[PDB]
Design a protein around this ligand. Structure first.
Ligand SMILES: N[C@H]1CC[C@H](CN2c3ccccc3Oc3ccc(Cl)cc32)CC1
Length: 273
């Protein structure tokens, strides 16, 4: 019944994640995103609790989509003969963090603090649910412009969280940690923290800190914008070369730069209205 339940609108984007369209749920006019993925291009499968063969992406989304959170929720899904179709929440109006930064340049620290805090809360939620995102970056973060609320997208490179080593990685290279570059090995949480350091730098500097493998491995951070000593410190800690020298999520959120975070609505009033 997919074609009757949803009115399809314009294409929003396409890439390694498939093709995503704007949509409306006909039942109640709820704005949705409709994501199509060809079966040929799915290397990663799992099974539901009740147990049919689905993309791992659906497993992971189902695990994180219970209750409210800073993740774009899976509302429904459908199987077609050559594709899967996912129905996702769609905030309106919305802009991804990559475009937002591209247009406004480097973010004021107050705005970066609010945004970074919300990303931490969302990643914590994922980890709590037993999901590792593995591609945390500006283009996988949506901003609900009216509410000042950030939402994580794209679990297509994600995995079940585990305490043992990962030796596969399909995320974005320039957000990938030095242990991946050097050894093709990482642990979930510490690699996530590295990607968070890259993200935070991107927010306050308006560009990523490392372009080449050699710079990632060297791990020396140069600031191109005026950034507070406390923010520089947090970034440098997240980007520690040794995984065990990086902060835990608790330590990031208890860091002095992260004090007195604005609520999402206040952030929208001050910075987005
Ligand atoms: N850098 C990208 C360019 C394409 C869109 C695609 N998109 C999406 C892509 C992949 C997985 C889930 C997605 O979930 C969405 C939910 C809601 C909207 Cl409005 C959009 C998506 C977002 C920004």
């Amino acid at each position: 019944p997919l074609e009757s339940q949803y009115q399809v609108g314009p294409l929003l984007g396409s890439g390694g994640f498939g093709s995503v369209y704007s949509g409306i749920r006909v039942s109640d006019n709820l704005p949705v995103a409709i994501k199509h993925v060809e079966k040929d291009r799915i290397s990663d499968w799992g099974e539901l609790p009740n147990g049919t063969r689905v993309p791992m992406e659906v497993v992971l989304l189902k695990k994180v989509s219970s209750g409210f959170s800073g993740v774009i929720r899976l509302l429904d899904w459908f199987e077609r003969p050559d594709s899967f179709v996912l129905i996702l929440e769609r905030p309106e109006p919305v802009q991804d963090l990559f475009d937002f930064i591209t247009e406004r340049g480097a973010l004021q620290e107050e705005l970066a603090r609010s945004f970074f805090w919300q990303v931490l809360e969302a990643v914590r939620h994922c980890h709590n649910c037993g999901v590792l995102h593995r591609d945390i970056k500006d283009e996988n973060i949506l901003i609900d412009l009216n509410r000042g609320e950030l939402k994580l997208i794209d679990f297509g490179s994600g995995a079940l969280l585990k305490d043992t080593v990962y030796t596969d990685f399909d995320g974005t290279r320039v957000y990938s940690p030095p242990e991946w570059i050097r050894y093709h090995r990482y642990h979930g949480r510490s690699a996530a923290v590295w990607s968070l350091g890259i993200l935070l730098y991107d927010m306050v500097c308006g560009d990523i800190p490392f372009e080449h493998d050699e710079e990632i491995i060297r791990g020396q951070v140069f600031f191109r914008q005026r950034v507070s000593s406390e923010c520089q410190h947090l970034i440098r800690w997240c980007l520690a070369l040794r995984p065990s020298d990086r902060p835990t999520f608790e330590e990031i959120q208890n860091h002095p730069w992260m004090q007195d975070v604005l609520l999402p609505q206040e952030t929208a009033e001050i910075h987005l209205h």
